[PDB]
Amino acid sequence: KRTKFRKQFRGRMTGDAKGGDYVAFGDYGLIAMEPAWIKSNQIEACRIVMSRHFRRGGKIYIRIFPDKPVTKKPAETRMGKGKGAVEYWVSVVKPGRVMFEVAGVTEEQAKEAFRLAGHKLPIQTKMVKREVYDEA
Amino acid sequence: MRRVAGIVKLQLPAGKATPAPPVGPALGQYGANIMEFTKAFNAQTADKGDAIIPVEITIYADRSFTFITKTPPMSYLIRKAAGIGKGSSTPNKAKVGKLNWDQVLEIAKTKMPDLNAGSVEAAANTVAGTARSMGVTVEGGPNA
Amino acid sequence: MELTAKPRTPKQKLDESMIAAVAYNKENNVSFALDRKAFDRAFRQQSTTGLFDITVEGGETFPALVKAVQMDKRKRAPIHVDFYMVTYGEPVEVSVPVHTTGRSQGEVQGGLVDIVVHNLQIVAPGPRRIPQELVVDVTKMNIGDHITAGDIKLPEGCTLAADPELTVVSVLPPR
RNA sequence: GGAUGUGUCGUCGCAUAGACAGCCAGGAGGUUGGCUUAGAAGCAGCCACCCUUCAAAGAGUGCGUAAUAGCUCACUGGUC
Q1: Which residues form a coiled coil (chain A)?
Q2: Which single residue of A41, B142, C56, C66 has CA 20 to 30 Å from C96?
Q3: Boundary of a domain, candidates B25, B42, B70
Protein backbone atom coordinates (compact mmCIF):
# COMPACT_ATOMS: atom_id res chain seq x y z
CA LYS A 1 0.00 0.00 0.00
CA ARG A 2 1.57 3.35 1.01
CA THR A 3 5.15 4.45 1.60
CA LYS A 4 5.79 5.83 5.10
CA PHE A 5 7.59 9.25 4.70
CA ARG A 6 9.01 10.84 1.48
CA LYS A 7 9.00 14.14 -0.55
CA GLN A 8 5.31 14.52 -1.84
CA PHE A 9 4.60 15.08 -5.62
CA ARG A 10 6.05 13.65 -8.96
CA GLY A 11 5.62 13.19 -12.78
CA ARG A 12 5.18 10.73 -15.70
CA MET A 13 7.20 9.02 -18.65
CA THR A 14 7.91 5.43 -20.19
CA GLY A 15 10.07 2.64 -21.82
CA ASP A 16 10.54 -1.18 -21.17
CA ALA A 17 11.20 -2.80 -17.70
CA LYS A 18 14.53 -2.44 -15.91
CA GLY A 19 14.68 -5.16 -13.33
CA GLY A 20 13.54 -7.65 -13.02
CA ASP A 21 12.17 -9.96 -15.64
CA TYR A 22 13.18 -13.06 -13.71
CA VAL A 23 11.56 -15.50 -11.32
CA ALA A 24 13.09 -15.46 -7.82
CA PHE A 25 11.46 -16.41 -4.45
CA GLY A 26 9.12 -18.87 -6.12
CA ASP A 27 8.13 -21.54 -8.59
CA TYR A 28 5.36 -19.75 -10.55
CA GLY A 29 5.21 -16.11 -11.58
CA LEU A 30 2.96 -13.47 -13.08
CA ILE A 31 4.23 -10.90 -15.51
CA ALA A 32 2.90 -7.58 -16.89
CA MET A 33 2.54 -7.15 -20.67
CA GLU A 34 1.53 -3.49 -20.76
CA PRO A 35 3.06 -0.14 -19.56
CA ALA A 36 0.44 0.60 -16.86
CA TRP A 37 0.27 2.45 -13.59
CA ILE A 38 -0.80 0.24 -10.71
CA LYS A 39 -2.68 1.53 -7.65
CA SER A 40 -2.36 0.11 -4.14
CA ASN A 41 -5.95 -1.15 -3.97
CA GLN A 42 -5.47 -2.94 -7.30
CA ILE A 43 -2.64 -4.95 -5.82
CA GLU A 44 -4.51 -5.18 -2.50
CA ALA A 45 -7.26 -6.70 -4.62
CA CYS A 46 -4.91 -9.24 -6.24
CA ARG A 47 -3.36 -10.04 -2.86
CA ILE A 48 -6.77 -10.73 -1.32
CA VAL A 49 -7.96 -12.74 -4.29
CA MET A 50 -4.93 -15.02 -4.36
CA SER A 51 -4.69 -15.20 -0.53
CA ARG A 52 -8.25 -16.44 -0.36
CA HIS A 53 -7.85 -18.95 -3.24
CA PHE A 54 -4.72 -20.46 -1.70
CA ARG A 55 -6.52 -20.57 1.66
CA ARG A 56 -3.92 -21.35 4.26
CA GLY A 57 -1.25 -20.99 3.33
CA GLY A 58 0.85 -21.17 0.15
CA LYS A 59 3.46 -18.45 -0.35
CA ILE A 60 2.83 -15.06 -1.95
CA TYR A 61 5.47 -12.60 -3.15
CA ILE A 62 4.09 -9.22 -4.14
CA ARG A 63 7.10 -7.90 -5.98
CA ILE A 64 5.67 -4.58 -7.20
CA PHE A 65 5.24 -1.65 -4.86
CA PRO A 66 3.53 1.83 -5.15
CA ASP A 67 6.02 4.57 -4.35
CA LYS A 68 4.59 7.06 -6.87
CA PRO A 69 2.21 9.78 -5.66
CA VAL A 70 -0.59 10.74 -8.11
CA THR A 71 -2.63 13.82 -7.51
CA LYS A 72 -6.01 15.09 -8.63
CA LYS A 73 -7.25 18.63 -8.34
CA PRO A 74 -10.34 19.35 -6.14
CA ALA A 75 -13.84 19.07 -7.58
CA GLU A 76 -14.77 21.89 -9.99
CA THR A 77 -11.75 24.16 -9.89
CA ARG A 78 -10.38 26.28 -12.68
CA MET A 79 -6.83 25.17 -13.58
CA GLY A 80 -3.89 26.65 -11.64
CA LYS A 81 -3.91 27.95 -8.04
CA GLY A 82 -1.65 24.93 -7.37
CA LYS A 83 -0.83 21.31 -7.91
CA GLY A 84 -3.41 18.71 -6.96
CA ALA A 85 -2.99 17.08 -3.59
CA VAL A 86 -2.08 13.38 -3.54
CA GLU A 87 -5.16 11.44 -4.52
CA TYR A 88 -3.56 8.02 -4.41
CA TRP A 89 -0.41 5.86 -5.06
CA VAL A 90 0.72 4.01 -8.15
CA SER A 91 3.61 1.64 -9.02
CA VAL A 92 4.92 2.19 -12.51
CA VAL A 93 4.98 -1.48 -13.68
CA LYS A 94 6.64 -1.56 -17.18
CA PRO A 95 6.20 -4.52 -19.57
CA GLY A 96 7.90 -7.81 -18.79
CA ARG A 97 8.32 -6.85 -15.13
CA VAL A 98 7.27 -9.66 -12.79
CA MET A 99 4.45 -8.53 -10.55
CA PHE A 100 3.76 -11.75 -8.70
CA GLU A 101 5.43 -14.84 -7.34
CA VAL A 102 3.62 -17.76 -5.81
CA ALA A 103 4.96 -21.06 -4.67
CA GLY A 104 4.01 -23.92 -2.42
CA VAL A 105 1.01 -24.62 -4.60
CA THR A 106 0.39 -26.92 -7.57
CA GLU A 107 0.50 -25.76 -11.20
CA GLU A 108 -3.31 -25.81 -11.28
CA GLN A 109 -3.67 -23.71 -8.13
CA ALA A 110 -1.08 -21.28 -9.51
CA LYS A 111 -2.90 -20.94 -12.87
CA GLU A 112 -6.21 -20.24 -11.21
CA ALA A 113 -5.01 -17.84 -8.45
CA PHE A 114 -3.23 -16.02 -11.23
CA ARG A 115 -6.25 -15.81 -13.59
CA LEU A 116 -8.40 -14.57 -10.78
CA ALA A 117 -5.77 -11.89 -10.01
CA GLY A 118 -5.57 -11.04 -13.72
CA HIS A 119 -9.23 -10.21 -14.13
CA LYS A 120 -8.71 -7.65 -11.32
CA LEU A 121 -5.86 -6.02 -13.26
CA PRO A 122 -5.66 -2.92 -15.56
CA ILE A 123 -3.52 -4.81 -18.06
CA GLN A 124 -2.96 -8.08 -19.88
CA THR A 125 -0.62 -10.56 -18.18
CA LYS A 126 1.16 -13.89 -18.60
CA MET A 127 2.18 -16.60 -16.09
CA VAL A 128 5.52 -18.45 -16.39
CA LYS A 129 7.90 -20.77 -14.43
CA ARG A 130 11.63 -20.31 -13.54
CA GLU A 131 14.81 -21.04 -15.70
CA VAL A 132 15.63 -17.31 -15.59
CA TYR A 133 18.98 -17.69 -13.81
CA ASP A 134 20.48 -14.41 -14.88
CA GLU A 135 21.42 -14.56 -11.22
CA ALA A 136 20.26 -15.97 -7.89
CA MET B 1 -50.04 -51.85 1.65
CA ARG B 2 -48.86 -53.21 -1.73
CA ARG B 3 -46.25 -55.24 -3.63
CA VAL B 4 -43.37 -52.90 -4.57
CA ALA B 5 -40.32 -54.71 -3.13
CA GLY B 6 -37.03 -53.15 -2.03
CA ILE B 7 -33.46 -53.86 -0.84
CA VAL B 8 -32.68 -51.12 1.70
CA LYS B 9 -29.32 -50.63 3.46
CA LEU B 10 -29.04 -48.66 6.71
CA GLN B 11 -27.44 -48.61 10.19
CA LEU B 12 -28.90 -48.50 13.73
CA PRO B 13 -27.50 -48.43 17.31
CA ALA B 14 -27.81 -51.91 18.86
CA GLY B 15 -29.17 -51.50 22.39
CA LYS B 16 -31.76 -48.74 21.92
CA ALA B 17 -35.45 -48.44 20.95
CA THR B 18 -35.29 -46.01 18.00
CA PRO B 19 -37.64 -42.96 17.79
CA ALA B 20 -38.46 -40.65 14.85
CA PRO B 21 -34.90 -39.71 13.77
CA PRO B 22 -33.64 -43.27 13.00
CA VAL B 23 -36.42 -45.56 11.66
CA GLY B 24 -40.00 -44.24 11.72
CA PRO B 25 -40.62 -43.38 8.02
CA ALA B 26 -37.22 -44.49 6.60
CA LEU B 27 -37.99 -48.17 5.93
CA GLY B 28 -41.55 -48.37 7.29
CA GLN B 29 -42.51 -46.76 3.97
CA TYR B 30 -41.83 -49.88 1.87
CA GLY B 31 -44.08 -52.16 3.96
CA ALA B 32 -42.78 -53.91 7.09
CA ASN B 33 -43.64 -54.43 10.79
CA ILE B 34 -42.01 -52.16 13.39
CA MET B 35 -43.74 -53.81 16.40
CA GLU B 36 -41.80 -57.05 15.82
CA PHE B 37 -38.38 -55.47 15.19
CA THR B 38 -38.31 -53.82 18.63
CA LYS B 39 -38.72 -57.41 19.89
CA ALA B 40 -36.59 -58.97 17.12
CA PHE B 41 -33.34 -57.03 16.55
CA ASN B 42 -33.29 -55.45 20.03
CA ALA B 43 -33.03 -58.99 21.46
CA GLN B 44 -29.93 -59.90 19.43
CA THR B 45 -28.15 -56.82 20.81
CA ALA B 46 -28.08 -58.79 24.04
CA ASP B 47 -25.57 -60.89 22.09
CA LYS B 48 -22.80 -58.34 21.37
CA GLY B 49 -23.36 -55.31 23.62
CA ASP B 50 -22.62 -51.56 23.32
CA ALA B 51 -21.94 -50.65 19.65
CA ILE B 52 -23.57 -49.63 16.34
CA ILE B 53 -24.00 -53.02 14.63
CA PRO B 54 -24.98 -52.40 10.94
CA VAL B 55 -28.24 -53.94 9.66
CA GLU B 56 -29.47 -54.61 6.10
CA ILE B 57 -33.23 -54.80 5.58
CA THR B 58 -34.99 -56.35 2.57
CA ILE B 59 -38.75 -55.82 2.24
CA TYR B 60 -40.95 -58.09 0.09
CA ALA B 61 -44.45 -56.63 0.51
CA ASP B 62 -47.55 -56.79 2.75
CA ARG B 63 -46.24 -57.29 6.32
CA SER B 64 -42.96 -59.02 5.35
CA PHE B 65 -39.34 -58.16 6.16
CA THR B 66 -35.99 -59.97 6.35
CA PHE B 67 -32.83 -58.52 7.94
CA ILE B 68 -29.11 -59.28 8.34
CA THR B 69 -27.20 -58.18 11.47
CA LYS B 70 -23.44 -57.73 10.90
CA THR B 71 -20.54 -56.69 13.16
CA PRO B 72 -20.09 -53.97 15.84
CA PRO B 73 -17.65 -51.24 14.76
CA MET B 74 -14.85 -51.41 17.35
CA SER B 75 -14.59 -47.63 17.05
CA TYR B 76 -16.57 -47.82 20.31
CA LEU B 77 -13.79 -50.11 21.66
CA ILE B 78 -10.80 -48.13 20.27
CA ARG B 79 -12.10 -44.89 21.76
CA LYS B 80 -12.55 -47.13 24.81
CA ALA B 81 -8.98 -48.39 24.24
CA ALA B 82 -7.60 -44.94 25.08
CA GLY B 83 -9.90 -42.54 26.93
CA ILE B 84 -11.79 -40.29 24.50
CA GLY B 85 -15.48 -41.03 23.90
CA LYS B 86 -15.47 -38.84 20.79
CA GLY B 87 -12.86 -39.14 18.03
CA SER B 88 -9.71 -37.11 17.46
CA SER B 89 -10.11 -33.58 16.03
CA THR B 90 -7.62 -34.64 13.36
CA PRO B 91 -5.86 -38.01 12.73
CA ASN B 92 -2.43 -36.45 11.98
CA LYS B 93 -2.36 -33.44 14.35
CA ALA B 94 -3.81 -34.96 17.58
CA LYS B 95 -3.70 -38.75 18.09
CA VAL B 96 -5.73 -41.01 20.41
CA GLY B 97 -4.04 -44.16 21.76
CA LYS B 98 -2.67 -47.56 20.66
CA LEU B 99 -4.42 -50.97 20.46
CA ASN B 100 -2.74 -54.36 19.95
CA TRP B 101 -2.30 -56.98 17.23
CA ASP B 102 -4.48 -59.20 19.48
CA GLN B 103 -7.32 -56.66 19.64
CA VAL B 104 -7.07 -57.17 15.89
CA LEU B 105 -7.81 -60.89 16.37
CA GLU B 106 -11.31 -59.95 17.63
CA ILE B 107 -11.77 -57.64 14.65
CA ALA B 108 -10.99 -60.28 12.04
CA LYS B 109 -12.86 -63.07 13.86
CA THR B 110 -16.17 -61.27 14.42
CA LYS B 111 -15.70 -59.90 10.87
CA MET B 112 -15.25 -63.30 9.20
CA PRO B 113 -18.43 -63.08 7.11
CA ASP B 114 -17.12 -59.57 6.29
CA LEU B 115 -13.63 -58.85 4.90
CA ASN B 116 -13.35 -60.95 1.73
CA ALA B 117 -9.62 -61.07 2.51
CA GLY B 118 -7.73 -64.32 2.92
CA SER B 119 -4.72 -64.85 5.17
CA VAL B 120 -4.21 -63.38 8.66
CA GLU B 121 -1.92 -60.58 7.42
CA ALA B 122 -4.60 -59.29 5.02
CA ALA B 123 -7.50 -59.59 7.49
CA ALA B 124 -5.37 -57.78 10.12
CA ASN B 125 -3.95 -54.95 8.00
CA THR B 126 -7.41 -54.18 6.49
CA VAL B 127 -8.90 -52.86 9.76
CA ALA B 128 -5.44 -51.77 10.78
CA GLY B 129 -6.40 -49.25 8.10
CA THR B 130 -9.64 -48.15 9.84
CA ALA B 131 -7.51 -47.30 12.89
CA ARG B 132 -5.23 -45.11 10.77
CA SER B 133 -7.39 -42.09 9.88
CA MET B 134 -9.41 -42.50 13.09
CA GLY B 135 -6.41 -40.93 14.82
CA VAL B 136 -4.75 -43.73 16.82
CA THR B 137 -1.13 -44.99 16.47
CA VAL B 138 -0.43 -48.70 15.89
CA GLU B 139 1.50 -51.12 18.12
CA GLY B 140 3.67 -53.27 15.89
CA GLY B 141 4.71 -53.96 12.32
CA PRO B 142 7.57 -56.12 10.99
CA ASN B 143 10.88 -56.86 12.80
CA ALA B 144 11.16 -56.49 16.62
CA MET C 1 24.82 -28.52 -31.66
CA GLU C 2 26.13 -27.15 -34.98
CA LEU C 3 26.23 -23.36 -35.52
CA THR C 4 27.74 -21.93 -38.69
CA ALA C 5 28.62 -18.28 -39.29
CA LYS C 6 29.71 -15.54 -36.92
CA PRO C 7 29.97 -12.14 -38.55
CA ARG C 8 29.20 -8.96 -36.58
CA THR C 9 26.10 -8.80 -38.85
CA PRO C 10 22.84 -10.52 -37.73
CA LYS C 11 20.46 -10.20 -40.75
CA GLN C 12 21.77 -13.57 -42.02
CA LYS C 13 19.90 -15.47 -39.28
CA LEU C 14 17.62 -13.18 -37.20
CA ASP C 15 14.15 -14.41 -38.20
CA GLU C 16 15.49 -17.84 -39.22
CA SER C 17 15.40 -18.73 -35.50
CA MET C 18 19.04 -18.54 -34.42
CA ILE C 19 20.66 -17.09 -31.30
CA ALA C 20 23.68 -14.81 -31.30
CA ALA C 21 26.41 -16.31 -29.15
CA VAL C 22 30.03 -16.19 -28.04
CA ALA C 23 32.24 -18.99 -26.74
CA TYR C 24 35.57 -18.05 -25.22
CA ASN C 25 38.52 -20.35 -24.46
CA LYS C 26 40.20 -17.62 -22.32
CA GLU C 27 42.96 -17.77 -24.92
CA ASN C 28 40.81 -18.44 -27.98
CA ASN C 29 37.60 -16.32 -28.51
CA VAL C 30 34.85 -17.02 -31.06
CA SER C 31 31.53 -15.35 -31.96
CA PHE C 32 28.78 -17.34 -33.76
CA ALA C 33 25.09 -18.27 -34.09
CA LEU C 34 23.17 -21.44 -33.08
CA ASP C 35 19.76 -22.81 -34.18
CA ARG C 36 17.31 -21.68 -31.49
CA LYS C 37 15.25 -24.93 -31.44
CA ALA C 38 18.45 -26.87 -30.77
CA PHE C 39 19.82 -24.71 -27.93
CA ASP C 40 16.32 -24.73 -26.47
CA ARG C 41 16.11 -28.51 -26.29
CA ALA C 42 19.69 -28.37 -25.08
CA PHE C 43 19.74 -25.66 -22.40
CA ARG C 44 16.51 -27.10 -21.10
CA GLN C 45 18.22 -30.50 -20.77
CA GLN C 46 21.65 -29.51 -19.45
CA SER C 47 21.15 -26.01 -17.91
CA THR C 48 24.06 -23.87 -16.60
CA THR C 49 26.11 -26.89 -15.49
CA GLY C 50 25.53 -28.18 -19.01
CA LEU C 51 28.57 -29.42 -20.98
CA PHE C 52 27.92 -30.11 -24.65
CA ASP C 53 29.88 -30.39 -27.91
CA ILE C 54 30.16 -27.53 -30.38
CA THR C 55 31.26 -28.12 -34.00
CA VAL C 56 31.72 -24.87 -35.96
CA GLU C 57 30.97 -25.07 -39.72
CA GLY C 58 34.69 -25.55 -40.41
CA GLY C 59 35.40 -28.95 -38.88
CA GLU C 60 36.75 -28.10 -35.40
CA THR C 61 34.57 -29.38 -32.52
CA PHE C 62 35.08 -28.20 -28.93
CA PRO C 63 33.30 -28.97 -25.61
CA ALA C 64 31.69 -26.13 -23.58
CA LEU C 65 29.54 -24.94 -20.68
CA VAL C 66 26.87 -22.17 -20.36
CA LYS C 67 28.07 -19.01 -18.54
CA ALA C 68 25.23 -16.52 -19.12
CA VAL C 69 21.98 -16.09 -21.07
CA GLN C 70 20.43 -12.85 -22.32
CA MET C 71 16.69 -12.53 -22.80
CA ASP C 72 14.04 -10.44 -24.49
CA LYS C 73 12.25 -8.98 -21.48
CA ARG C 74 8.95 -8.58 -23.35
CA LYS C 75 9.00 -11.77 -25.44
CA ARG C 76 10.69 -13.81 -22.71
CA ALA C 77 12.98 -15.67 -25.04
CA PRO C 78 16.74 -16.02 -25.76
CA ILE C 79 18.41 -13.41 -27.98
CA HIS C 80 22.07 -13.89 -26.90
CA VAL C 81 24.36 -16.40 -25.08
CA ASP C 82 27.64 -16.27 -23.12
CA PHE C 83 29.47 -19.60 -23.52
CA TYR C 84 32.45 -20.87 -21.47
CA MET C 85 34.88 -23.07 -23.46
CA VAL C 86 35.63 -25.74 -20.84
CA THR C 87 39.18 -26.67 -19.81
CA TYR C 88 39.92 -30.13 -18.39
CA GLY C 89 41.01 -30.50 -14.77
CA GLU C 90 39.89 -27.30 -13.09
CA PRO C 91 36.99 -25.19 -14.54
CA VAL C 92 35.18 -22.34 -12.83
CA GLU C 93 32.48 -22.14 -10.15
CA VAL C 94 29.23 -23.97 -10.84
CA SER C 95 25.74 -22.79 -9.85
CA VAL C 96 23.53 -25.83 -9.15
CA PRO C 97 19.89 -26.30 -8.09
CA VAL C 98 19.01 -27.28 -4.54
CA HIS C 99 16.25 -29.85 -4.62
CA THR C 100 14.25 -31.59 -1.92
CA THR C 101 13.34 -35.23 -1.32
CA GLY C 102 10.79 -37.23 0.63
CA ARG C 103 7.69 -36.10 2.49
CA SER C 104 9.11 -33.72 5.09
CA GLN C 105 7.71 -33.87 8.59
CA GLY C 106 6.99 -30.19 8.21
CA GLU C 107 4.18 -30.43 5.68
CA VAL C 108 2.40 -32.87 7.97
CA GLN C 109 1.85 -30.72 11.07
CA GLY C 110 1.50 -27.22 9.65
CA GLY C 111 4.00 -25.74 7.25
CA LEU C 112 5.77 -26.17 3.93
CA VAL C 113 9.13 -26.74 2.24
CA ASP C 114 10.60 -23.41 1.08
CA ILE C 115 13.85 -23.45 -0.95
CA VAL C 116 15.03 -20.06 0.39
CA VAL C 117 17.88 -20.07 -2.18
CA HIS C 118 17.04 -21.98 -5.37
CA ASN C 119 20.55 -21.90 -6.81
CA LEU C 120 23.77 -22.70 -4.92
CA GLN C 121 27.09 -21.69 -6.42
CA ILE C 122 29.93 -24.02 -5.49
CA VAL C 123 33.63 -23.83 -6.24
CA ALA C 124 34.94 -26.55 -8.56
CA PRO C 125 34.49 -30.30 -9.07
CA GLY C 126 37.06 -31.27 -11.66
CA PRO C 127 35.18 -30.55 -14.96
CA ARG C 128 34.08 -33.70 -16.80
CA ARG C 129 32.16 -34.54 -13.67
CA ILE C 130 29.94 -31.65 -12.58
CA PRO C 131 27.10 -32.11 -10.11
CA GLN C 132 23.98 -31.25 -12.14
CA GLU C 133 21.51 -31.35 -9.24
CA LEU C 134 21.93 -31.45 -5.44
CA VAL C 135 19.49 -33.50 -3.29
CA VAL C 136 18.91 -32.37 0.31
CA ASP C 137 16.96 -34.55 2.76
CA VAL C 138 14.17 -32.78 4.60
CA THR C 139 12.28 -35.64 6.28
CA LYS C 140 13.98 -34.84 9.61
CA MET C 141 12.98 -31.21 9.30
CA ASN C 142 10.25 -29.71 11.46
CA ILE C 143 8.59 -26.29 11.34
CA GLY C 144 11.06 -23.59 12.34
CA ASP C 145 14.02 -25.59 11.07
CA HIS C 146 16.65 -23.84 8.88
CA ILE C 147 19.23 -25.73 6.75
CA THR C 148 22.52 -23.75 6.60
CA ALA C 149 24.79 -24.03 3.53
CA GLY C 150 27.27 -26.11 5.51
CA ASP C 151 25.15 -29.23 5.98
CA ILE C 152 24.96 -29.93 2.22
CA LYS C 153 26.65 -33.18 1.12
CA LEU C 154 29.14 -32.26 -1.61
CA PRO C 155 30.29 -35.08 -3.96
CA GLU C 156 34.09 -35.10 -3.21
CA GLY C 157 36.50 -32.55 -4.70
CA CYS C 158 33.79 -29.89 -4.27
CA THR C 159 33.87 -26.85 -1.97
CA LEU C 160 31.45 -24.05 -1.09
CA ALA C 161 31.54 -20.50 -2.47
CA ALA C 162 28.55 -19.94 -0.20
CA ASP C 163 28.87 -18.53 3.31
CA PRO C 164 28.00 -21.89 4.86
CA GLU C 165 25.83 -20.57 7.69
CA LEU C 166 23.48 -18.94 5.16
CA THR C 167 19.89 -20.12 5.21
CA VAL C 168 18.91 -22.49 2.40
CA VAL C 169 15.95 -24.93 2.12
CA SER C 170 13.93 -23.90 5.19
CA VAL C 171 10.45 -25.07 6.23
CA LEU C 172 7.95 -22.29 7.00
CA PRO C 173 4.92 -22.15 9.39
CA PRO C 174 1.35 -21.82 8.04
CA ARG C 175 -0.86 -18.70 7.50
C1' G D 1 -13.55 -10.06 -21.49
C1' G D 2 -15.04 -14.04 -24.53
C1' A D 3 -15.16 -17.89 -28.92
C1' U D 4 -14.25 -26.60 -31.86
C1' G D 5 -14.11 -19.32 -37.32
C1' U D 6 -10.06 -20.05 -40.72
C1' G D 7 -4.75 -20.03 -42.41
C1' U D 8 0.50 -20.84 -40.38
C1' C D 9 4.27 -22.41 -37.01
C1' G D 10 5.86 -24.77 -32.18
C1' U D 11 5.19 -27.66 -27.59
C1' C D 12 3.40 -31.87 -25.24
C1' G D 13 0.34 -36.38 -24.96
C1' C D 14 -1.87 -40.76 -26.31
C1' A D 15 -2.01 -44.67 -29.70
C1' U D 16 -0.13 -51.91 -34.57
C1' A D 17 0.66 -53.59 -25.86
C1' G D 18 -5.65 -51.54 -30.25
C1' A D 19 -6.28 -45.58 -28.29
C1' C D 20 -9.76 -40.34 -28.74
C1' A D 21 -15.58 -40.77 -29.83
C1' G D 22 -19.57 -44.45 -30.01
C1' C D 23 -21.75 -49.05 -27.56
C1' C D 24 -22.37 -53.50 -23.38
C1' A D 25 -20.94 -54.18 -18.02
C1' G D 26 -18.60 -53.68 -13.35
C1' G D 27 -17.98 -49.95 -10.62
C1' A D 28 -16.20 -52.23 -5.46
C1' G D 29 -15.51 -54.84 1.46
C1' G D 30 -13.73 -52.43 5.46
C1' U D 31 -16.59 -47.50 5.97
C1' U D 32 -22.02 -43.46 8.08
C1' G D 33 -13.13 -42.75 7.61
C1' G D 34 -12.32 -39.00 11.67
C1' C D 35 -13.85 -34.28 13.06
C1' U D 36 -18.57 -30.98 13.10
C1' U D 37 -23.66 -31.82 13.62
C1' A D 38 -30.58 -31.37 15.12
C1' G D 39 -28.90 -35.18 11.22
C1' A D 40 -23.76 -34.65 7.16
C1' A D 41 -23.15 -41.32 5.65
C1' G D 42 -18.12 -39.25 -1.85
C1' C D 43 -21.00 -34.61 -2.08
C1' A D 44 -22.71 -27.23 4.11
C1' G D 45 -17.39 -26.50 6.98
C1' C D 46 -11.50 -28.67 9.63
C1' C D 47 -7.13 -33.08 9.08
C1' A D 48 -5.38 -37.65 5.92
C1' C D 49 -5.62 -39.74 1.21
C1' C D 50 -4.53 -46.67 4.23
C1' C D 51 -5.92 -52.01 3.20
C1' U D 52 -9.04 -55.97 0.84
C1' U D 53 -10.54 -58.69 -4.02
C1' C D 54 -8.86 -58.37 -9.27
C1' A D 55 -8.12 -58.11 -16.14
C1' A D 56 -10.54 -53.17 -13.39
C1' A D 57 -12.92 -50.39 -9.57
C1' G D 58 -10.05 -43.75 -6.53
C1' A D 59 -12.30 -41.72 1.90
C1' G D 60 -13.77 -40.52 -5.26
C1' U D 61 -16.51 -35.87 -10.08
C1' G D 62 -21.59 -33.42 -10.90
C1' C D 63 -26.71 -33.71 -10.15
C1' G D 64 -29.50 -35.50 -5.70
C1' U D 65 -31.68 -35.80 0.03
C1' A D 66 -33.60 -31.97 5.74
C1' A D 67 -29.74 -36.64 6.02
C1' U D 68 -30.39 -41.89 3.34
C1' A D 69 -31.23 -44.19 -0.77
C1' G D 70 -30.71 -42.90 -6.04
C1' C D 71 -28.01 -41.12 -11.62
C1' U D 72 -22.78 -40.88 -13.45
C1' C D 73 -17.97 -40.26 -14.05
C1' A D 74 -11.72 -41.31 -12.93
C1' C D 75 -9.92 -47.44 -14.00
C1' U D 76 -10.50 -52.12 -16.79
C1' G D 77 -12.63 -55.86 -20.46
C1' G D 78 -15.12 -56.71 -24.90
C1' U D 79 -16.32 -53.99 -29.46
C1' C D 80 -14.08 -52.02 -33.31
Answers
A1: none
A2: C56
A3: B70
